[PDB]
Structure 1
C-alpha cells in the first residue's frame, strides 16, 4: 500500500529489506513490541493458592 508494489514483487523479500523499504518511504511502524508480564497471585482461602 505505502510503496507502489504488488505482492508478487515483494515475495522472497526478507524482513530487513522490507523494513528498509518502509523506512525510506517514511513509515516508522515496522517493529514488534514485547508485552510486560504482570505478576499475579491468587489468595489461598481453602485451596493452597496459585
Structure 2
C-alpha cells in the first residue's frame, strides 16, 4: 500500500529487506515490541513453590 508495489515483488523479500523499503519511504512502524511481564502477588494454584 505505502510503497506502491505488488505482492509478487515482495514475496521473496526478507524481513530486513522489507524493513529497509518502508524506512526509506518514511515509515517507522516496522518493529515488534515485547510486552513487560508482571509477577502475580500470590502463588498460582497447583504450582507449588513457583
Q: TM-score, normalised by structure 1?
A: 0.80
Which protein shows a greater Rg?
Answer: 1
| RMSD value, Cα | 3.1
Question: Judging changes above 3 Å, is the alpha-carbon distance between structure 1 residues 49 and 25 closer, same or farther for their aligned structure 2 residues?
Answer: same
- Deviation for aligned residue 1:24: 0.3
CA deviations on 1:1-44 (whole Å, 9 max, x unpaired) are 00010101101100000000000000000000000001003379
Number of equivalenced pairs: 50
Q: TM-score, normalised by structure 2?
A: 0.80
Moved over 6 A (4+): 43-50
